[PDB]
PDB file of C-alpha atoms (C1' of nucleotides) and ligand atoms in Angstrom:
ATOM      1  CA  UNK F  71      62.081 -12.746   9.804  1.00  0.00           C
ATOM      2  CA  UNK F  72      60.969 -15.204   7.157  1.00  0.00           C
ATOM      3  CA  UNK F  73      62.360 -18.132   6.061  1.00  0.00           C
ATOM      4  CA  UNK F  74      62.034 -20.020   2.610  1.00  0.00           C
ATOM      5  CA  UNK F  75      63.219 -23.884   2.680  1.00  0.00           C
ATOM      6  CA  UNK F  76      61.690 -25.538   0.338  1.00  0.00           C
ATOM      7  CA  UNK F  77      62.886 -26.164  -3.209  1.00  0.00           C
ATOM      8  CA  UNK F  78      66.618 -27.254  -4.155  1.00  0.00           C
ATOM      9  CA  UNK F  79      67.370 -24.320  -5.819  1.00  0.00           C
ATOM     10  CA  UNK F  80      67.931 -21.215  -4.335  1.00  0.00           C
ATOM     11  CA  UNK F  81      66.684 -18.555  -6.395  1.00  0.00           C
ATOM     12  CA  UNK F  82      63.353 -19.749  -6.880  1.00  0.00           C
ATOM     13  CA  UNK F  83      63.801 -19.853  -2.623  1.00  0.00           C
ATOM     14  CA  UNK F  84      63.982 -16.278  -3.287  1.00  0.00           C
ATOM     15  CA  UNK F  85      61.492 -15.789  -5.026  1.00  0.00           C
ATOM     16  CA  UNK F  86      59.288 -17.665  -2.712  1.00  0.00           C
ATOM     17  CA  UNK F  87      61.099 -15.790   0.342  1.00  0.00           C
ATOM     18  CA  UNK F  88      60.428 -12.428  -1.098  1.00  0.00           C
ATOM     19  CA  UNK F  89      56.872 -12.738  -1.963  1.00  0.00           C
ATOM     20  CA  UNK F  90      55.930 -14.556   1.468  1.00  0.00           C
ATOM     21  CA  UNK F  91      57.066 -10.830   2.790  1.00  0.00           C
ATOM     22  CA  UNK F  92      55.166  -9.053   0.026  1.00  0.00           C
ATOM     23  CA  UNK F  93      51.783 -10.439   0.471  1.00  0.00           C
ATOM     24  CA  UNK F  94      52.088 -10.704   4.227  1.00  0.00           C
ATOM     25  CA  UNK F  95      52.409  -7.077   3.928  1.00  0.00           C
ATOM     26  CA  UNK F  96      49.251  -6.465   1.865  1.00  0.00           C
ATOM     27  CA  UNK F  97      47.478  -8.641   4.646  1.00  0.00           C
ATOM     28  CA  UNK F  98      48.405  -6.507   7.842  1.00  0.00           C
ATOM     29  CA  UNK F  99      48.259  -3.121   5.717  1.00  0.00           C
ATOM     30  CA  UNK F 100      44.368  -3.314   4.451  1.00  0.00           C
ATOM     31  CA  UNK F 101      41.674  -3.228   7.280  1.00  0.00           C
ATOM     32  CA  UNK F 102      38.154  -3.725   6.813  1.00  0.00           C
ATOM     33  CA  UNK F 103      35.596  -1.131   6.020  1.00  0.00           C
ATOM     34  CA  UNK F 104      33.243   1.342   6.075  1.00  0.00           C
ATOM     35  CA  UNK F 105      30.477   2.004   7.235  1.00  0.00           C
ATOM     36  CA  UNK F 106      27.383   1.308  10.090  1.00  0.00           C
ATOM     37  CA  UNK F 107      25.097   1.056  11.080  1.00  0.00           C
ATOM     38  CA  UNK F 108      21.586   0.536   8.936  1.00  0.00           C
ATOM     39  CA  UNK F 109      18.485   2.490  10.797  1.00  0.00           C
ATOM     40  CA  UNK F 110      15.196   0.936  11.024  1.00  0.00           C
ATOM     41  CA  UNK F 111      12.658   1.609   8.111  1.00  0.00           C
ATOM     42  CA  UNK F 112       9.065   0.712   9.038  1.00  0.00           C
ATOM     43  CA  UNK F 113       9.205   1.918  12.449  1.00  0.00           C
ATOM     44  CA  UNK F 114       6.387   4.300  11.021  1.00  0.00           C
ATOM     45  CA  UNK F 115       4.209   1.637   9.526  1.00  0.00           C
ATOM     46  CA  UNK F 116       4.874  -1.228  11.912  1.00  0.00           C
ATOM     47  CA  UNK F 117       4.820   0.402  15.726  1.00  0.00           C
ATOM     48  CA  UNK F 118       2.208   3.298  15.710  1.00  0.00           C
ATOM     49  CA  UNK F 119       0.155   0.120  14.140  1.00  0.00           C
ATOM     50  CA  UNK F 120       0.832  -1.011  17.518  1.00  0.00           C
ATOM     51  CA  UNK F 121      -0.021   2.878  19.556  1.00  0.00           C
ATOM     52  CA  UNK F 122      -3.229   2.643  17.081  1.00  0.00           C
ATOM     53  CA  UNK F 123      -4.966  -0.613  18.331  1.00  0.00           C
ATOM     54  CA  UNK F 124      -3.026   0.505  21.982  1.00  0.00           C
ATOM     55  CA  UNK F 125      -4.530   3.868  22.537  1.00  0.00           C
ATOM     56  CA  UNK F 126      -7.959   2.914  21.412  1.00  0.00           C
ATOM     57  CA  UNK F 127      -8.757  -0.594  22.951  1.00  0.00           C
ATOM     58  CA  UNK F 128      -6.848   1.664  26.446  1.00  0.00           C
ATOM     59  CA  UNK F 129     -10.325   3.266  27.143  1.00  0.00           C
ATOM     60  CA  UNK F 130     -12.034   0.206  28.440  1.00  0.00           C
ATOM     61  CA  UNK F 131     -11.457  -1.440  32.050  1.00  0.00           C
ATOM     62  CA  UNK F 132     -10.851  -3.081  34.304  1.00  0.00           C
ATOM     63  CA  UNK F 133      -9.395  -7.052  35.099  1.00  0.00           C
TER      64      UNK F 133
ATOM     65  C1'   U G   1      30.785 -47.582   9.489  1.00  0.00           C
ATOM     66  C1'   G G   2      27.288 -42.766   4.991  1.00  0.00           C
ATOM     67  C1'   C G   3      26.533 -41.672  -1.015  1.00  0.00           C
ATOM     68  C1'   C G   4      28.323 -43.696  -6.233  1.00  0.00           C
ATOM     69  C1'   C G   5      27.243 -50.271  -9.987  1.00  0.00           C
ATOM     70  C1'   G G   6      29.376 -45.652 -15.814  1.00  0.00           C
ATOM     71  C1'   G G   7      34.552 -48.644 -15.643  1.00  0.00           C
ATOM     72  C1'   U G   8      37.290 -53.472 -13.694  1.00  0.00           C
ATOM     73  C1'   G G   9      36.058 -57.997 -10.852  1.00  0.00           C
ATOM     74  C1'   C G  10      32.617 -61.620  -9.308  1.00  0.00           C
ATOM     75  C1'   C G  11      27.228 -63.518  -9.569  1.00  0.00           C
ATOM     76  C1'   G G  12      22.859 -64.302 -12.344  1.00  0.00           C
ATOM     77  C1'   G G  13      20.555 -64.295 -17.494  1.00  0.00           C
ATOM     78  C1'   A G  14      17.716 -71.727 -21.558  1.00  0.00           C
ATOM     79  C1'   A G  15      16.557 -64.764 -25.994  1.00  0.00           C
ATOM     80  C1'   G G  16      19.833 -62.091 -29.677  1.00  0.00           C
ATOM     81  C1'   G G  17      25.299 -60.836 -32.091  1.00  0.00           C
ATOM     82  C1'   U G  18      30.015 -62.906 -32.819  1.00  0.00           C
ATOM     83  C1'   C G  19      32.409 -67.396 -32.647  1.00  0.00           C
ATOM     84  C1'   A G  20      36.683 -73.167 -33.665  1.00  0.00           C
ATOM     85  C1'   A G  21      37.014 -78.199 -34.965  1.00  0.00           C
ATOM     86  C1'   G G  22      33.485 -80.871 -37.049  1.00  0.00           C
ATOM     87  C1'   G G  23      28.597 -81.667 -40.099  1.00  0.00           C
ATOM     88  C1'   G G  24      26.674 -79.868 -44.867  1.00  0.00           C
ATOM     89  C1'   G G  25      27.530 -79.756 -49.582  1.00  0.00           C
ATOM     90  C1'   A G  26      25.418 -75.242 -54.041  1.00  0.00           C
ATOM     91  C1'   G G  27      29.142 -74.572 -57.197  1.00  0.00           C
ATOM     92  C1'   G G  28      34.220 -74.587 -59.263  1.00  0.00           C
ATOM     93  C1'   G G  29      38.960 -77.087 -60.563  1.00  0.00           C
ATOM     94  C1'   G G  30      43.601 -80.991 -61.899  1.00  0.00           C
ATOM     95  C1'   U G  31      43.729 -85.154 -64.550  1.00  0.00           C
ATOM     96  C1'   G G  32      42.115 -89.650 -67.686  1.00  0.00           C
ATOM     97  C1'   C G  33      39.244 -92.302 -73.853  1.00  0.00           C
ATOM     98  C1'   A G  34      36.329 -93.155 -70.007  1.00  0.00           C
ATOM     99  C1'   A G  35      34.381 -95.461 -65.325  1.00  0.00           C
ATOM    100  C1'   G G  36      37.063 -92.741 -61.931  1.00  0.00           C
ATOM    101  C1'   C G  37      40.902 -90.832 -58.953  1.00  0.00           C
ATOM    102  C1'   C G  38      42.393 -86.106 -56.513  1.00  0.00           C
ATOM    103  C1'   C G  39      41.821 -80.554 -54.675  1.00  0.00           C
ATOM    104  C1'   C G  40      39.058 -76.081 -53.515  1.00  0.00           C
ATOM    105  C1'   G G  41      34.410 -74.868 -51.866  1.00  0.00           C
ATOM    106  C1'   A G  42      28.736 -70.988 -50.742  1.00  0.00           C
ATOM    107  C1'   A G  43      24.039 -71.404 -47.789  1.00  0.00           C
ATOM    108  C1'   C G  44      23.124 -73.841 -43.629  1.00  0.00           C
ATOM    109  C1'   C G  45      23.637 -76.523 -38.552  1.00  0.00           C
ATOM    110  C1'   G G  46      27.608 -76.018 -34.895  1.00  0.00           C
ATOM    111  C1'   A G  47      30.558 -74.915 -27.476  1.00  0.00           C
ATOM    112  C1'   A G  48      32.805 -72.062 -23.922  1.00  0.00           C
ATOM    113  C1'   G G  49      34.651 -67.009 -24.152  1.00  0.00           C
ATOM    114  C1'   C G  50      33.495 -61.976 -25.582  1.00  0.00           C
ATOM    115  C1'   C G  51      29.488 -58.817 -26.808  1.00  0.00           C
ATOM    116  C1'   C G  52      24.669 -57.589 -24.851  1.00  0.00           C
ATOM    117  C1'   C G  53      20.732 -57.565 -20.001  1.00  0.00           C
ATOM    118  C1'   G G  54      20.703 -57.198 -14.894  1.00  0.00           C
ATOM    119  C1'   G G  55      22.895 -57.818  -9.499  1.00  0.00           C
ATOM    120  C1'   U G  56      26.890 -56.593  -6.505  1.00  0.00           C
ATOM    121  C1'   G G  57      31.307 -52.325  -1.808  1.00  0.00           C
ATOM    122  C1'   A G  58      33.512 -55.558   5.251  1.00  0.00           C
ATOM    123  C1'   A G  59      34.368 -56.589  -4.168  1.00  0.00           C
ATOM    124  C1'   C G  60      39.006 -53.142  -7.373  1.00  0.00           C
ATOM    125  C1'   G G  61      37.837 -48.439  -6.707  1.00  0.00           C
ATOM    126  C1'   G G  62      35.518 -43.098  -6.452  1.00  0.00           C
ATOM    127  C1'   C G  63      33.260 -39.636  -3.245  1.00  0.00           C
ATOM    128  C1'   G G  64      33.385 -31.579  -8.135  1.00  0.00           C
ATOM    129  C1'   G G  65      33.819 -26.495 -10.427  1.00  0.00           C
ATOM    130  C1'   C G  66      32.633 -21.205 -11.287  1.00  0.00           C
ATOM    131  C1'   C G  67      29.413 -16.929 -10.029  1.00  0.00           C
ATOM    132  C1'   G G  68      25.860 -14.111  -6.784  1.00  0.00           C
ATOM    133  C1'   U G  69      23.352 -13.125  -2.272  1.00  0.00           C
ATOM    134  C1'   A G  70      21.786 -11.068   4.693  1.00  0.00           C
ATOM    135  C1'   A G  71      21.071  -4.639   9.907  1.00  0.00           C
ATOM    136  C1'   C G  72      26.269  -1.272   4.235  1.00  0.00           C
ATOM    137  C1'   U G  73      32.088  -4.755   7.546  1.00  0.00           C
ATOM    138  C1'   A G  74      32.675  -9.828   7.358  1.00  0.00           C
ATOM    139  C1'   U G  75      30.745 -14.304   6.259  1.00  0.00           C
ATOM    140  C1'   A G  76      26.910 -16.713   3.305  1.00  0.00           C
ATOM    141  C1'   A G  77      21.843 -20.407   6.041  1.00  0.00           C
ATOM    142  C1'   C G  78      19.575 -18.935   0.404  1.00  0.00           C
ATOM    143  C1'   G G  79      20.177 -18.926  -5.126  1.00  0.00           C
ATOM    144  C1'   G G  80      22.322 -19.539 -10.534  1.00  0.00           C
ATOM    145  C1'   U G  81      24.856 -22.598 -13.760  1.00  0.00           C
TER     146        U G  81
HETATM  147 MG1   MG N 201      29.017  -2.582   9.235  1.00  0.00          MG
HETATM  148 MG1   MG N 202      -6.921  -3.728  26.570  1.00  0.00          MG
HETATM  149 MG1   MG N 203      -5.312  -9.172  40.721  1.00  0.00          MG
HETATM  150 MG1   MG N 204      32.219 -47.952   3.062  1.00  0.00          MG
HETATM  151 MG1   MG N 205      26.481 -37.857   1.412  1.00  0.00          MG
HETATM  152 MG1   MG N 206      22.891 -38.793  -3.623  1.00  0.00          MG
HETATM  153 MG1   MG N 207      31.065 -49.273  -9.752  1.00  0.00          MG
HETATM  154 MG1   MG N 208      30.057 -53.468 -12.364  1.00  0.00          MG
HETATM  155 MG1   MG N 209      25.656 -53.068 -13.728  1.00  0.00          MG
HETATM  156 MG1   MG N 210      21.088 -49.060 -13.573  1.00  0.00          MG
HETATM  157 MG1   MG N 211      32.911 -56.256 -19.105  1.00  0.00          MG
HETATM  158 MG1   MG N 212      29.001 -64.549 -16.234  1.00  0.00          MG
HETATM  159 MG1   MG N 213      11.660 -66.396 -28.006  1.00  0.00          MG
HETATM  160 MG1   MG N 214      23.568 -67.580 -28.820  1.00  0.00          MG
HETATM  161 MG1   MG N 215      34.257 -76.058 -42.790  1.00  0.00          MG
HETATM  162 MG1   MG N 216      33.596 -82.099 -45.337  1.00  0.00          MG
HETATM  163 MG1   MG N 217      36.354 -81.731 -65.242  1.00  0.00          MG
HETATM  164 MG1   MG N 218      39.182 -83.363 -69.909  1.00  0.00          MG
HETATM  165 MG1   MG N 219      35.278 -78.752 -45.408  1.00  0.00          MG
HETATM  166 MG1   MG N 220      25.371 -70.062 -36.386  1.00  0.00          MG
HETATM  167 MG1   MG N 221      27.942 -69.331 -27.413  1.00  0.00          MG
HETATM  168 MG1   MG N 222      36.656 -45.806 -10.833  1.00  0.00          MG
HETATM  169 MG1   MG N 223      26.712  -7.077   2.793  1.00  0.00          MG
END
RNA sequence: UGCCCGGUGCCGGAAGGUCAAGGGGAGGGGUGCAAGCCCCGAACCGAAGCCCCGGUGAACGGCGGCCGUAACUAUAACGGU
């Protein structure tokens, strides 16, 4: 239900009245996107830099 | 109680430009036989105002546009002009 009230003639009321449907339609019919998600890259690099320095420093004691 | 003094206003500025009456008369003219009488008149000097230089917002006022860009969507902290 959609009313158009403002101009003094009627047909250009219209012509508001119709669009206010058309473009409200357009809005409520397209829905986002695709797509998700991104995977991490350096994983490689970046943590077995952390299980190198780990694994090796790991053979000492104590605390 | 923020930013903008380009514009308008007001305030300041003993310089410069313009600028009226008036001063000044180079030079020209009417007339008379002539002394002369009469009229134009350049340079130049000659206010305020305006120009020009600045100040000023609890003075009048004014406080943008397009385009791109992030863990794919969105949006854009970031950029470009
Ligand atoms: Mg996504
Ligand atoms: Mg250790
Ligand atoms: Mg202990
Ligand atoms: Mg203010
Ligand atoms: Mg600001
Ligand atoms: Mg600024
Ligand atoms: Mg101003
Ligand atoms: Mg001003
Ligand atoms: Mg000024
Ligand atoms: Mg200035
Ligand atoms: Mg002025
Ligand atoms: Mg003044
Ligand atoms: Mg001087
Ligand atoms: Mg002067
Ligand atoms: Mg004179
Ligand atoms: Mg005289
Ligand atoms: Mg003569
Ligand atoms: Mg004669
Ligand atoms: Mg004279
Ligand atoms: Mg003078
Ligand atoms: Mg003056
Ligand atoms: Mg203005
Ligand atoms: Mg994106």
């Amino acid at each position: 239900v959609i009313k158009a009230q403002e101009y003094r003639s009627q047909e250009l009321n219209r012509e508001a009245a119709l669009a206010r449907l058309v473009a409200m339609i357009k809005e409520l019919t397209t829905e986002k996107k695709a797509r998700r998600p991104t995977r991490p890259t350096r994983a490689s690099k970046e943590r077995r830099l952390a299980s190198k320095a780990q694994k090796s420093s790991v053979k000492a004691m104590r605390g």
